[PDB]
Amino acid sequence: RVADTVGTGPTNSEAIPALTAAETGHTSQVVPGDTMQTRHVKNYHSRSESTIENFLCRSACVYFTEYKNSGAKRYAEWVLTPRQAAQLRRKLEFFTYVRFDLELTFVITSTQQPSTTQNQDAQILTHQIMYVPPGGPVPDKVDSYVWQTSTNPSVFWTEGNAPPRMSIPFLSIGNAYSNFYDGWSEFSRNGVYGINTLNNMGTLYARHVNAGSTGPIKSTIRIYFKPKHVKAWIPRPPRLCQYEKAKNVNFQPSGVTTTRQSITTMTNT
Amino acid sequence: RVADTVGTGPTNSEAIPALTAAETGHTSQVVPGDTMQTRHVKNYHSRSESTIENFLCRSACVYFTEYKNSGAKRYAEWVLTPRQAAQLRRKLEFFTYVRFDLELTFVITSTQQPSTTQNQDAQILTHQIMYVPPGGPVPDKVDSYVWQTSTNPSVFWTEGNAPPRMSIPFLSIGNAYSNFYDGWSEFSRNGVYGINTLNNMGTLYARHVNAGSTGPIKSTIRIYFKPKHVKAWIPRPPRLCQYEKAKNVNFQPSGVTTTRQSITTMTNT
Amino acid sequence: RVADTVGTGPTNSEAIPALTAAETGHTSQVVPGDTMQTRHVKNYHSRSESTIENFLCRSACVYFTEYKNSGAKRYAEWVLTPRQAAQLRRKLEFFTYVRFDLELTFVITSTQQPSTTQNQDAQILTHQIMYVPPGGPVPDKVDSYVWQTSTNPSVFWTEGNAPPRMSIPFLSIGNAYSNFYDGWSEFSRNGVYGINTLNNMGTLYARHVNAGSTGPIKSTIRIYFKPKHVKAWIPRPPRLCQYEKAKNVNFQPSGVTTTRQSITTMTNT
Amino acid sequence: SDRARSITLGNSTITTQECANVVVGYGVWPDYLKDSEATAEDQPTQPDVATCRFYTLDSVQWQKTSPGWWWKLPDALSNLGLFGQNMQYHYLGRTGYTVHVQCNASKFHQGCLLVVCVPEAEMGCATLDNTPSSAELLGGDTAKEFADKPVASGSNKLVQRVVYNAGMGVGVGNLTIFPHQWINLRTNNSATIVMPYTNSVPMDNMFRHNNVTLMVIPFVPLDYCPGSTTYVPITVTIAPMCAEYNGLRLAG
Amino acid sequence: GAQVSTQKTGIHYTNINYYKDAASNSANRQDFTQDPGKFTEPVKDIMIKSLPALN
Amino acid sequence: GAQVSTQKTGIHYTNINYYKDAASNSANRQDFTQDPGKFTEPVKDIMIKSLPALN
Amino acid sequence: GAQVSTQKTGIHYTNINYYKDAASNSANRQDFTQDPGKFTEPVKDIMIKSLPALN
Amino acid sequence: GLPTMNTPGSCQFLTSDDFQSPSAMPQYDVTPEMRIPGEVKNLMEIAEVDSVVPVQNVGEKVNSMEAYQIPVRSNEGSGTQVFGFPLQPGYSSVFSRTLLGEILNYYTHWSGSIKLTFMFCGSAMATGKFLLAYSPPGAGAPTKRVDAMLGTHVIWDVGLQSSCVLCIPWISQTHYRFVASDEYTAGGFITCWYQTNIVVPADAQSSCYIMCFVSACNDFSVRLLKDTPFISQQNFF
Amino acid sequence: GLPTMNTPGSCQFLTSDDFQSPSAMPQYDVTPEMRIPGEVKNLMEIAEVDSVVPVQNVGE
Amino acid sequence: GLPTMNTPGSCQFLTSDDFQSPSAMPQYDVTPEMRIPGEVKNLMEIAEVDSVVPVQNVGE
Numbered sequence A, B, C: 001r002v003a004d005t006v007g008t009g010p011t012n013s014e015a016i017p018a019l020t021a022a023e024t025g026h027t028s029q030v031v032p033g034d035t036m037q038t039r040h041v042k043n044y045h046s047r048s049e050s051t052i053e054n055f056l057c058r059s060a061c062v063y064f065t066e067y068k069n070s071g072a073k074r075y076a077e078w079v080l081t082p083r084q085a086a087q088l089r090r091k092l093e094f095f096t097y098v099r100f101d102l103e104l105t106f107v108i109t110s111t112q113q114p115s116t117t118q119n120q121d122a123q124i125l126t127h128q129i130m131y132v133p134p135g136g137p138v139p140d141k142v143d144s145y146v147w148q149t150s151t152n153p154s155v156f157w158t159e160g161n162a163p164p165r166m167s168i169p170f171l172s173i174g175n176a177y178s179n180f181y182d183g184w185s186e187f188s189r190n191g192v193y194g195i196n197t198l199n200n201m202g203t204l205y206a207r208h209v210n211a212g213s214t215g216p217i218k219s220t221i222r223i224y225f226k227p228k229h230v231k232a233w234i235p236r237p238p239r240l241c242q243y244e245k246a247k248n249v250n251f252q253p254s255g256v257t258t259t260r261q262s263i264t265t266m267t268n269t
Numbered sequence D: 001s002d003r004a005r006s007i008t009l010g011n012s013t014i015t016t017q018e019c020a021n022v023v024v025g026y027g028v029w030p031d032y033l034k035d036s037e038a039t040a041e042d043q044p045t046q047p048d049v050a051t052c053r054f055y056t057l058d059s060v061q062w063q064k065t066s067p068g069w070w071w072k073l074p075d076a077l078s079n080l081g082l083f084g085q086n087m088q089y090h091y092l093g094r095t096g097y098t099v100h101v102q103c104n105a106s107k108f109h110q111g112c113l114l115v116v117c118v119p120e121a122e123m124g125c126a127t128l129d130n131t132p133s134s135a136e137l138l139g140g141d142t143a144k145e146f147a148d149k150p151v152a153s154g155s156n157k158l159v160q161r162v163v164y165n166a167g168m169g170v171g172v173g174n175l176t177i178f179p180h181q182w183i184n185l186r187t188n189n190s191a192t193i194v195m196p197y198t199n200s201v202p203m204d205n206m207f208r209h210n211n212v213t214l215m216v217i218p219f220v221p222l223d224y225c226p227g228s229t230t231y232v233p234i235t236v237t238i239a240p241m242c243a244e245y246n247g248l249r250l251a252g
Numbered sequence E, F, G: 001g002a003q004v005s006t007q008k009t010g011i012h013y014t015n016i017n018y019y020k021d022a023a024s025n026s027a028n029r030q031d032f033t034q035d036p037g038k039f040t041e042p043v044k045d046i047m048i049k050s051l052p053a054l055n
Numbered sequence H: 001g002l003p004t005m006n007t008p009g010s011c012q013f014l015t016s017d018d019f020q021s022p023s024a025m026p027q028y029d030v031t032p033e034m035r036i037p038g039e040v041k042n043l044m045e046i047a048e049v050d051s052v053v054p055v056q057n058v059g060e061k062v063n064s065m066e067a068y069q070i071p072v073r074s075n076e077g078s079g080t081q082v083f084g085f086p087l088q089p090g091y092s093s094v095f096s097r098t099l100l101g102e103i104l105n106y107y108t109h110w111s112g113s114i115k116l117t118f119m120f121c122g123s124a125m126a127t128g129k130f131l132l133a134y135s136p137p138g139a140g141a142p143t144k145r146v147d148a149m150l151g152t153h154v155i156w157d158v159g160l161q162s163s164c165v166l167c168i169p170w171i172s173q174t175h176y177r178f179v180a181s182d183e184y185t186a187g188g189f190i191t192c193w194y195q196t197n198i199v200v201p202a203d204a205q206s207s208c209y210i211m212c213f214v215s216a217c218n219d220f221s222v223r224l225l226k227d228t229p230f231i232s233q234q235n236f237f
Numbered sequence I, J: 001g002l003p004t005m006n007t008p009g010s011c012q013f014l015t016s017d018d019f020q021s022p023s024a025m026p027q028y029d030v031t032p033e034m035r036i037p038g039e040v041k042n043l044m045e046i047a048e049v050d051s052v053v054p055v056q057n058v059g060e
């Protein structure tokens, strides 16, 4: 981790650690004792908060969807990506290739909707969240045969309990997920660009298992991703521009930095 | 599990691994190095997802019934079979004989029913699910003496808790359950065909133990089967046709495959 | 801990333990056997309730705020300090420098607010409390992108469960928190006095994650601090005056003690 | 002494008199694929000295106003030699590179270039609901150029090229985490980077994925006084390293 | 009476059985023995590849 | 990795730590060391009772 | 089959794995190995400070 | 069963918690790893890498490459300033979007030494000397060369070897400093002056540029994760 | 009793979970096994068996 | 799972309780200690120190 400062006295020598050539593409290994007289300091500081498995291993909200126990929008569909929401996305894009296991956690809430229904009296709601791996049947309605879940992972959750959670393995067909792809999936080099199937990891469906009330209730499910067991390769400059789309790297040109008055001024504007 | 590819150089030999006779009823044991030059590859792939105790060991919804705390249909009756619902049924019918222990899990939900009752105010519902082994008394009403459960297994469940579950042994009188029976139970060879008593495993009853509200509440119980400790013998071709009935193998004649334009075309229709 | 009394007989000696000079700034070490005849007593008393890690290690309410699921004041903001509430503050100010780990515990309650809304029917409330370390984005509304919590610690709590709690390390940039600062942060010695950044430890935000009801509900969150793993240095006279402000040591001049009739009277007034 | 260098690959030899060392990747030198990382079961083709040798690309003038240039690596050598004839007959291949950029000018000239090899440099589009076409990203040994002003948004399949965002939406001054050297005209006249194969798969098709992009970007413009040479070229030379190919089929 | 077994990896876990019936135990997930030679090669005579199947 | 320590009496208890941070541990209640001699008797010369404080 | 490891301090804790998959385990927090020499000093020749970078 | 009791914090979702949870796909074997070049195991690996600093950033310079360039020229006399900016990465306009500075808007606290490198990009006939100074805080910025040579400084002579390093020692009352602006944990000021004029012959440009780089030393550390103020959204993308 | 704390994922029904659960019929002894020909222990056993491919499949 | 039973006093917040609770900031290393003069470990240390008594306290 952090290294200890070593004491140094006066010099007058043919050594020149301060002078260097930065054209070589090498970062100089100069320490403070080289350029000045220092005392010996014992350092007890650590670099344990800046591990990759600390930086990326906190739950982050990626998406939220709504669905109702009446009318249209009886269920919610979402294709799992960590690219809908800015904050998690930016952190993963300090790297080109990442490999991790997910832990999904769901915060499901319900809100009574305005109506003129007399004598509402909800029963407790039970919700079903169904993970469907790539390919295979997709529910086209609440009350299809796809919600049987004979071989699709699924959880059921009654209100007023702890959030559900489940672990997902590393599901890539590649040896790492890629956050950037500089190519086309077609051999003609036509169609969509930057689209790849290394990051597929199914679709998520959510519904009510009962309409408890005679009146309308609308639920909101929020999905949290927590990377764990992380490994990362090839670091990249942070994103400077705001994101526009979830499938593209497209951007509006942004200035390098914010301005200031002069090149000698000691304040920001 | 998966085997390692072995490197091979040029050949010119009296050996003929590629030529075979497929009339012998033997599947050829040719590997890629036989027919071409290969490199040596180490494989670290496994066949752990295709074990029979992975394939069949996930909960699957088999049935659901409804019952009310008022009027007619005060309780639900169901004879335990894994043949009401398509998805579980198809998986078990990759085999002729299977032997397993069940784990039943019940998802019980309640929904307020429309009425003109003023000042409804439900108390928490408690439900009783009663397993009755083959033979013995059958409840003919809610509030019969059969719900005493002196010697019938039974569970009680109050709303807003975890789903009940219970394990069931292997209950066959035979040494395995049979998924197919090519015979009659009668010695005359009259009556129903394909009916056998190796797969009996009682009837399930479900009711409300209280009507909490002054208004009407209707509950829905969903039964989930999870095979475990599985053993299976004699594999069979998968079902090609849609199922029609739960006691018969009856089918509508279906084509072998879907069509395409030509025998040289590289797309489906 | 407590020491044992030692027996003593008559004296007539050139020893003078009773006579002392109190000008020396030394507290006399006279024990009762010095000035009179005593018996030998075994003491089994202990000083275990007057440890610093007993005195300061009990939960104490520091603040409470309110927020609603409708209208203005959708969330609550509070900068963490143990100086809003008198009782905890006074105990810590028996010392100049303290060092401890917090344990936060939150008691969150909700109260229905009067309205003319017909057919209210609340769903269970879920609350989010978000800790934001010094610097970084601050939510400016309910439904901002800051409540994503990609890297800010956060808890979610559904009603009718145990209070949340979390431990916080010792977060000072100094080697101890200071309860007193006799200086300015500016080098000019202008601006606010007694203001220092050794005691920064972020801001706390709290909101509803759903409005469950059609009618208005107002919640109250109460924050409890419990010091633990305490170390304390340099003791100080207790506060004699009532506190006025949370950032100042400002006071109204108070008499030394309460009065009594005479210097020979044996009662208080 | 430390400034002289010679690199020999196949027929080719490069010699420089001013050299800033050689940068090697992420401290990984090109190697052939192992049999404990391989997936494909056929015997590789390894042409050796018919693929792994220096190829010069077209030169491009450095002017007082020039914004920069980029070349996408497997598709800038795709028409050249037997490197180009092995990647259209095979489905797979993997290779590292040695990139050598030359630019010589007098001791009365000044300027500075940044030479970077950027893994998977995916580049934005001027219009925000389209992605670029393959005729705006890929040259073929001709360099594509950046712009100094934003590309206007039409109904475009154009690339958003601006030097200061690098066409990727990042600060251009932070491209120094990628293997890099500077050509500063008062010091050195050449730069050498040796890239290893970087991908998340052991081999990949090279006619629809570009796994590296070379960019040469002026940070200090070219300047000289009247009477000096006004034409200063920048030549790029690229050699494959440990090329393999697998999956022999028909051309295309 | 705890069993310690290896986990599925690209460590170890501990398990105690709590019930008196062996139908209450968790599913057997880690049984990987197999023998495809009953369904492939059910022939009485031994087939050798690199020799005629029929003489 | 359990610690066994004595209880406060006029027996013993068992404790296991469950978390990887040492700020998650329960409070230290049983530390009874003390030294009042910093605040009482801070004088440079050693005071002996049964002798004049000032000669 | 318990592991006993040291906590982060300015003691020890106990952990048992309960599941048969190694993707169910808690996050690895205490891996502190590092090597900045891939990204700093990627040069082929060894640079010695206190000697010219270019002769 | 076994008598148990629940404590505060049961049935909560803390986003920083580490607990075990069952897999939704059991007995799934993951694909093998391959060695990919340039594995990262710490973010202080990639904060020790030089990154061009946009010292200029005055009006319309941030929308060009002129931000990174620092003017120097032949002028009458010497002892005129070249640049000045305050030490406070992850706050200052100059340093907030540098590679060092963006691994430091995810943290509340920072400690250790920082090394600036300068690279002279004139012609090879140009020559000059500079005074690269750093002043601890408590007396404001130096406004003359003679005020600036009372702090830490290095005199840089340009010849062969076209770079020089000004290493900024850690001189602080506290062990850590805030990333965000506070006057209690003020950093000091970094300034540059002509020690000697830029001297050129005829037919060589008398205007030259300097480029600046910044990286952390090996005694550097960061602490206390937080959200960055530099990414936003109004809706899902 | 023993101080405990519940974590996320308590009182959920995950369909892929493996936990122990009490038997509804305790001390029930199951019928003996017999050796039945052709036991299957993996599905890659029965994917290694030749199967006639319908190459033609054009209209009727 | 393991059969358990809850006792009275579950889901209460007693202000005097000592239980362990997870940290909101994991792997956070705290600043080193320094020796500061006059550490206090008991309050009977600082009750053994002489303090001027206001014996008179009659009116003003």
Ligand SMILES: O=C(O)c1ccc(NS(=O)(=O)c2ccc(N3C(=O)c4ccccc4C3=O)cc2)cc1
Residues within 6 Å of the ligand: A061, A066, A085, A222, C143, C144, C145, C146, C147, C148, H233, H234, H235, H236
């Ligand atoms: O609270 C958070 O966790 C949360 C809040 C905001 C957020 N990101 S955001 O870009 O600020 C954002 C802000 C609002 C919405 N949004 C709505 O508020 C809404 C209401 C009704 C339908 C659809 C939507 C919907 O897309 C979506 C994203 C992420 C998470």
Ligand SMILES: *C(=O)CCCCCCCCCCCCC
Residues within 6 Å of the ligand: E001, E002, E016, E017, E018, E019, J002, J003
């Ligand atoms: C062998 O079983 C003894 C090993 C130690 C057992 C620890 C038991 C854990 C708690 C009891 C589980 C009891 C289930 C009925």
Ligand SMILES: *C(=O)CCCCCCCCCCCCC
Residues within 6 Å of the ligand: F001, F002, F016, F017, F018, F019, G002, G004, G013, G014, G015, G016
């Ligand atoms: C040393 O720690 C081993 C002694 C026996 C440990 C019994 C553990 C009790 C149950 C597990 C607690 C685990 C907390 C993460």
Ligand SMILES: *C(=O)CCCCCCCCCCCCC
Residues within 6 Å of the ligand: E002, E004, E013, E014, E015, E016, G001, G002, G016, G017, G018, G019
């Ligand atoms: C090694 O694992 C044996 C050490 C003692 C184990 C105590 C186990 C604690 C209670 C059981 C946890 C079981 C999780 C499935």
